[PDB]
Structure formats: structure tokens, C-alpha cells
Amino acid sequence: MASMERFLSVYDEVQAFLLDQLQSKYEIDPNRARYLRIMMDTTCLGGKYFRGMTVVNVAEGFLAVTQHDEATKERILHDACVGGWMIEFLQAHYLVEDDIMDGSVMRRGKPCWYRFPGVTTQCAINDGIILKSWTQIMAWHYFADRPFLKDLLCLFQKVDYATAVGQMYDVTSMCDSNKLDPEVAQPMTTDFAEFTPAIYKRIVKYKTTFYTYLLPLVMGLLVSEAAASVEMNLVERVAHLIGEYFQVQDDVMDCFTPPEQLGKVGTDIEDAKCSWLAVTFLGKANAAQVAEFKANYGEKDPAKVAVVKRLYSKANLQADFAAYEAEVVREVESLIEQLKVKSPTFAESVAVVWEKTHKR
Amino acid sequence: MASMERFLSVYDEVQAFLLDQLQSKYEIDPNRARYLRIMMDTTCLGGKYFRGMTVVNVAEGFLAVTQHDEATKERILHDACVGGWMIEFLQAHYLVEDDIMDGSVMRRGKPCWYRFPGVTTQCAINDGIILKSWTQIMAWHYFADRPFLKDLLCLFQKVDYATAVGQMYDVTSMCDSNKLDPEVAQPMTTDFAEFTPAIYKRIVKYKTTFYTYLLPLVMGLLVSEAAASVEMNLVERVAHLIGEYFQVQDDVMDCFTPPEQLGKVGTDIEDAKCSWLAVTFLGKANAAQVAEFKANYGEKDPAKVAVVKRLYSKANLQADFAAYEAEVVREVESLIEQLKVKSPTFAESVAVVWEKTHKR
Ligand SMILES: Cc1ccc(CN2CCS(=O)(=O)CC2)cc1
Numbered sequence: 001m002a003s004m005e006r007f008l009s010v011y012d013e014v015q016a017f018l019l020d021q022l023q024s025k026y027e028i029d030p031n032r033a034r035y036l037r038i039m040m041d042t043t044c045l046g047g048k049y050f051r052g053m054t055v056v057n058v059a060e061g062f063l064a065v066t067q068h069d070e071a072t073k074e075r076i077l078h079d080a081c082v083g084g085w086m087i088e089f090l091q092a093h094y095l096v097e098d099d100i101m102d103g104s105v106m107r108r109g110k111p112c113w114y115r116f117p118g119v120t121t122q123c124a125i126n127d128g129i130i131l132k133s134w135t136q137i138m139a140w141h142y143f144a145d146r147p148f149l150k151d152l153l154c155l156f157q158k159v160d161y162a163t164a165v166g167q168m169y170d171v172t173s174m175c176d177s178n179k180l181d182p183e184v185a186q187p188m189t190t191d192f193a194e195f196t197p198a199i200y201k202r203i204v205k206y207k208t209t210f211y212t213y214l215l216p217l218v219m220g221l222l223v224s225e226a227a228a229s230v231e232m233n234l235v236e237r238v239a240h241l242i243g244e245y246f247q248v249q250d251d252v253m254d255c256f257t258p259p260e261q262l263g264k265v266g267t268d269i270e271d272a273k274c275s276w277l278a279v280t281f282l283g284k285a286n287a288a289q290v291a292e293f294k295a296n297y298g299e300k301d302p303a304k305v306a307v308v309k310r311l312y313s314k315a316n317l318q319a320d321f322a323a324y325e326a327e328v329v330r331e332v333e334s335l336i337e338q339l340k341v342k343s344p345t346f347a348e349s350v351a352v353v354w355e356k357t358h359k360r
Numbered sequence: 361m362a363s364m365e366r367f368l369s370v371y372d373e374v375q376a377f378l379l380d381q382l383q384s385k386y387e388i389d390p391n392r393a394r395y396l397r398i399m400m401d402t403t404c405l406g407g408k409y410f411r412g413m414t415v416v417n418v419a420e421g422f423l424a425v426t427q428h429d430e431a432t433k434e435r436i437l438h439d440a441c442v443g444g445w446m447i448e449f450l451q452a453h454y455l456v457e458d459d460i461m462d463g464s465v466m467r468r469g470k471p472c473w474y475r476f477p478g479v480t481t482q483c484a485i486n487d488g489i490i491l492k493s494w495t496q497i498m499a500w501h502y503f504a505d506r507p508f509l510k511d512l513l514c515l516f517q518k519v520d521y522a523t524a525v526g527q528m529y530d531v532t533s534m535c536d537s538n539k540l541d542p543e544v545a546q547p548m549t550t551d552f553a554e555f556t557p558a559i560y561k562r563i564v565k566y567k568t569t570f571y572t573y574l575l576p577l578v579m580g581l582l583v584s585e586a587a588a589s590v591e592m593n594l595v596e597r598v599a600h601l602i603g604e605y606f607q608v609q610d611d612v613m614d615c616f617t618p619p620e621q622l623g624k625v626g627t628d629i630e631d632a633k634c635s636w637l638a639v640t641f642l643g644k645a646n647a648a649q650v651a652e653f654k655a656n657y658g659e660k661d662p663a664k665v666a667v668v669k670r671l672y673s674k675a676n677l678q679a680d681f682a683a684y685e686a687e688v689v690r691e692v693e694s695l696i697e698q699l700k701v702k703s704p705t706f707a708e709s710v711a712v713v714w715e716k717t718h719k720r
Pocket residue numbers: 063064065066067068
């Protein structure tokens with residue numbers, strides 16, 4: 001069976017299981033089940049499934065080099081699909097809540113879930129809670145007797161928690177740290193002293209790399225019983241590196257990809273986000289450029305947003321991006337090679353993850 | 361040591377552990393740690409700790425009848441405190457998010473967390489996520505090698521999930537089921553056909569009884585290694601019964617307790633909630649009363665809210681409440697007795713839980 005149709009089939013299976021259980025154990029009525037069905041589909045489906053399919057691809061890599069009965073191949077692949085959906089539904093939780101937190105309008109060319117007329121914020125906050133609760137119910141049902149249950153649940157939680165800490169670092173990235181205070185409304189920084197490469201790398205490490213790259217790779221190892229084919233410090237290092245590059249790309253696209261292809265109107269400028277473009281621009285600007293940036297950034301006024309975009313274009317950030325890209329290519333290739341000391345197979349899955357990111 | 365000072369001490373311990381770990385493992389800076397500290401205190405502290413202290417009291421009950429080394433008594437009590445905080449922090453998650461979902465102003469005579477000036481909804485949604493993530497980090501740290509870890513984590517998840525399903529039943533309780541539809545803005549029911557005792561009991565069972573009464577009782581059994589001193593179907597039955605009574609009391613207080621003592625201005629009428637008062641009123645009203653209720657319920661207009669309160673007062677709902685209370689007293693005493701077949705001790709803890717609820 002091809003991997004993607006397997007993965008999509010298991011979605012239907014898992015959906016049916018969740019909804020059936022709601023009717024048999026939680027007293028749900030058919031109409032609320034239908035609401036939840038539609039919510040699940042709307043929030044979990046229509047992406048590329050990169051994350052969840054990475055679990056499947058890592059497991060397929062090991063299957064090719066490990067002896068197993070056919071029934072065991074099938075079980076491993078089924079477990080990789082269930083694990084992949086756990087990550088997809090965890091992402092769906094994040095996207096639902098982040099869209100509400102940010103006041104976002106669109107995502108992938110459709111309205112954010114909370115904006116649907118019969119949803120509203122009141123229900124959407126809790127729908128997003130249910131999305132993450134479903135990752136747990138999947139795990140406890142499908143993995144009940146698996147030797148990797150403990151390790152998978154402990155990994156998932158730590159990744160979830162890193163991700164929420166990353167969200168805190170992102171939402172507070174334009175405040176001055178020393179002014180953070182629940183009692184006092186938070187002003188935008190005026191110095192931008194915290195718009196540094198290291199502070200940027202911390203936001204991105206936590207907010208996206210743990211759930212986007214570390215979790216799918218490590219979940220593929222766990223369902224394969226293969227965590228001894230790797231040196232875990234290398235897997236962390238490479239996940240955090242590729243993940244950062246991925247986010248740099250998104251940051252650049254927020255500013256410069258047309259909204260039709262981007263799937264939304266990018267607002268990182270208006271939102272005063274600590275983006276790669278802002279940090280890179282500040283890292284090369286002269287005094288007059290810095291002052292122009294300060295006078296215009298973090299404002300809704302379209303004229304001011306256009307002043308920032310013009311500053312970025314004139315500053316030749318494409319060159320800084322090429323230099324960054326080159327360095328990432330170097331270090332990701334060095335880590336892949338270190339990963340072959342223990343598993344050629346795992347190293348190749350990491351190569352493929354790299355190729356999908358670099359050349360999307 | 362007295363139980364409550366033990367419990368409060370462990371709060372300080374757990375807080376220090378969480379914040380220390382954020383600095384050693386998650387790259388947090390001192391100012392963000394302070395924000396999180398203040399968030400934790402603000403959202404977790406200042407209640408009665410009923411839930412968390414019930415775990416401690418169940419464990420203290422068993423300790424009095426079971427032989428153990430002193431160091432084991434201490435470990436069991438420490439584990440009961442950590443488990444109790446897991447429930448308190450899970451409640452804090454619920455209250456933070458519910459206050460945002462409902463647009464609430466106050467809770468326990470102070471502003472809702474999201475209303476604090478330096479918080480805002482954007483940060484508060486994620487603070488509430490972190491609250492629940494912390495229940496997991498507590499568990500994996502303090503219970504890493506405990507024989508009850510699996511059972512405790514599986515119980516916690518199912519309780520969390522029931523609670524979120526209960527929130528869905530609550531937020532949708534004034535819609536007609538057959539009209540639920542993400543695509544269509546939801547009208548208030550005009551027939552109130554779904555304001556029944558059974559539908560009410562389903563909302564309340566899920567939204568509060570699993571986390572308020574079942575989880576503390578069962579967590580006390582788990583940290584005591586005492587789940588064989590009970591018949592679990594009886595523990596469920598009694599938890600769901602006491603929990604329902606608790607919520608009926610809250611529903612009555614929302615309408616009739618002065619806001620100063622209630623800790624907030626009650627809005628269940630304006631919010632069109634399926635409250636015990638509404639369901640009981642509809643269960644005895646004549647046609648003219650029903651029509652007056654329909655014309656006034658679920659409106660912000662204070663004059664209309666006063667018309668509903670007047671209908672309730674004239675309908676002698678205090679008598680229906682006394683009749684309900686009497687019946688609950690009967691059934692809770694019958695269940696306590698059934699609980700003595702296997703554990704006098706556990707039955708007495710349930711008696712105390714009952715006494716704290718009935719006579720608060
Ligand atoms: C010990 C060992 C022997 C052979 C192989 C290759 N193998 C072919 C048959 S299979 O269906 O098991 C898929 C992988 C790997 C390991």
C-alpha cells in the first residue's frame with residue numbers, strides 16, 4: 001500500500017473510533033458528533049501532512065532493513081500512522097488557538113475555525129482543547145499494550161510543553177523583558193535590543209522545531225523500536241537546525257509571498273514580530289535605517305508597513321538569506337554524516353526531511 | 361504535620377521545580393519566569409483547595425489503617441499533595457479558558473486573568489495551556505518510577521477529556537441540537553425542549569463531576585495503592601451524584617447570592633444557560649409562565665432578567681430544591697453504605713466530601 005493512502009485511511013479509522021467512543025461512553029448525541037466530525041476535518045485536513053508522514057517515512061526506512069513478519073510490518077505502519085495523526089491533531093490544536101490568540105483571519109485560503117459562523121471564539125477555544133485531548137485518547141487506545149507507550153507519552157508531553165513555552169516567547173518577543181508584568185499593559189520595545197539572532201533562535205527553537213521536526217523523527221524511531229540506531233543528541237541538533245531554516249522561510253514568505261499563494265495576508269510587520277527579516281535588517285542597518293525602521297515598525301498604517309518592506313528590499317536581505325542557506329546546507333550535511341555512524345537508514349530519512357524543506 | 365500546610369508547602373516545592381526546570385532546560389529568562397510565577401499564583405491559589413485536599417484526605421484515611429514505614433507515609437502524603445496540585449492546576453486551566461470563552465469579568469472577587477492589563481487574551485489562552493502542561497510535567501517528574509503512573513495518567517486524561525466534552529455540552533445547551541452547524545450562526549432555542557432534567561444532568565456530569573469529585577477520590581486511591589479497597593462503579597456513582605448537587609447549588613447561587621458574596625455578577629439568565637433553576641421552573645410552570653419565561657430569558661436587558669428572577673421566586677423553587685436535596689441525601693447515604701462492604705475508611709472519606717458539599 002502507498003504510504004499516503006495508508007495514512008489517510010487511518011485518519012478515517014481514527015475519526016470513527018473517536019466518534020463511536022463519544023457515543024458509547026460520553027453520551028453524545030448525533031448532532032454534536034457531527035459538529036465534532038466537521039471540526040476535526042476542518043482543522044486536521046487539507047495540509048501536506050508533512051509532520052505525520054515523516055513518522056511513516058522513518059518507519060518505512062527501518063522496515064526495509066529489519067526482519068519482521070508481514071503482520072508486524074503492518075502493525076508498525078499502522079502505529080506510525082496513528083502517531084503521525086497525533087502530531088497532526090497536536091498541530092491542529094496549536095493552529096486553532098494561535099489563530100484566536102492572534103486575531104487571524106485566514107489560514108490556507110479559508111477562514112480560521114473560530115471565524116466560522118456557527119463556531120465562534122467561545123466554542124473554538126474548547127474545540128482546540130478537544131483536538132489535543134484526542135491525541136491522548138488515540139495513544140491510550142492504539143498503544144495500550146505497546147512497549148513504547150511510556151516513552152512516546154513522555155516525549156509528546158515534553159514537546160507540547162516546549163511548544164507552549166515557544167508560543168510565550170513569540171507573543172512576548174516585541175516587549176522589553178524587564179517590563180513584563182501582568183499588572184501593566186505592555187508597550188512595544190522602542191530599542192529593539194532584544195531583536196538578536198540568539199533571541200530569535202530561541203523563539204523558533206521552542207515554538208516550532210520540537211513539534212515539526214523533533215517529534216516526527218523521534219516518534220518514527222519509537223514506533224520502530226529503533227531509538228538505539230541513533231545518537232539522540234544528533235537527532236536533536238539536526239531537528240533544531242532544519243526547523244529554524246523552515247521558520248526563516250516562513251518569515252520571509254510572510255512579507256514577500258503574494259497573499260493568494262501564501263494563503264493569508266501576512267501581518268508580521270504590523271504585529272511587530274521578531275522575524276528573521278527584522279533581526280537580519282537590524283544586524284546590517286546604518287543609524288538612519290535603524291531610525292526609519294523604529295519609526296515605522298509594528299503599526300497598522302499601510303504606508304508605514306510599506307516603508308518597512310521598502311527598507312527590507314533595499315537592504316539586500318536576499319544575500320543574507322543565501323549566506324544563511326549555505327551555512328545551514330553545510331551543517332545539515334555534517335549532521336547527516338554523523339547520523340550514518342549508527343544508521344544509514346535514519347540518516348536517509350533525515351535527508352529526505354531536509355530535501356522537502358530546502359526544496360519546497 | 362497538618363494536611364493543609366503540607367499541601368501548601370508542596371505548592372512552593374512544585375513551583376520551584378517548574379521554574380527551575382524552565383531555566384535549566386527551556387532557556388527561560390528571569391523576567392518570563394517571574395511572569396509565569398505570578399500567573400501560577402494568580403490562577404492556582406486563593407480557593408479552598410477542595411479538590412486537591414480531597415486527594416490528601418483520602419490518602420490520610422488509608423494511612424490510618426495500613427502498616428507502613430514512616431518514610432513511606434511521607435512519600436504517600438507527598439504524592440497525594442502532588443496529585444492534588446495536578447487537579448488544582450487542571451482546574452486553573454479550565455477557569456482561565458472558561459473565563460475567556462464566556463467573556464467573564466470577575467472570579468472570586470478579582471479580575472479574570474485575561475483581563476489583567478499586562479496579560480490580555482493573546483497571552484492568557486496560552487497561559488491556560490501551560491497550566492495544563494504543568495500537570496503533566498509534575499506527574500512525569502514526581503511519579504516517574506511509581507507503580508501507579510500509568511493508571512494515574514490514563515485516569516487524568518479521560519477526566520480531562522470528559523471535562524472538555526462537558527464544556528461543549530454547556531456552551532451549546534441553549535441551541536437546538538438539530539440546528540448545530542459550523543457554517544450557520546446559532547440561534548437561541550425558542551422552544552426550550554432541551555431544558556430537561558436528563559439533558560441538564562448530562563451537562564453537569566461531564567463539565568464538573570469528573571474533575572471535581574471523581575478525580576480527587578480516585579487519585580487518592582491510586583497514590584495509596586488502594587483501588588482494590590473499592591468497587592469502582594460505586595465510586596463513580598457517588599462522585600456523579602455529589603457533583604450534580606454541587607452544581608445545582610452553584611446554579612442557584614448564580615441567580616440569588618449577592619454578587620459581593622458570590623465573587624462575581626451572575627449572568628446565567630442573560631447567557632441563556634441550561635441551569636437547574638430554568639429546567640425546574642419549566643418542569644412546573646403553566647402555559648402563561650412558560651410564555652413569559654420565553655419572552656424574557658437569554659437577554660441582557662436588566663428589566664427582562666428581573667422578570668425571570670421574579671418568575672423563579674414566585675414558583676417556589678426553594679421547595680423543589682428541598683425535595684431534590686432530600687433525595688440526594690438518601691441516595692448518597694445508600695452509596696456510602698454500599699462503600700463499607702469493601703472499605704469503611706474510603707466510605708468515611710466520601711462522607712466527609714459529602715459533608716463539605718452539603719454544609720458549605
Ligand atoms: C535480517 C534481515 C534480512 C533481510 C532484510 C531485508 N528484508 C527483506 C524482507 S522483509 O520483508 O522483512 C523487508 C526487509 C533485512 C533484515
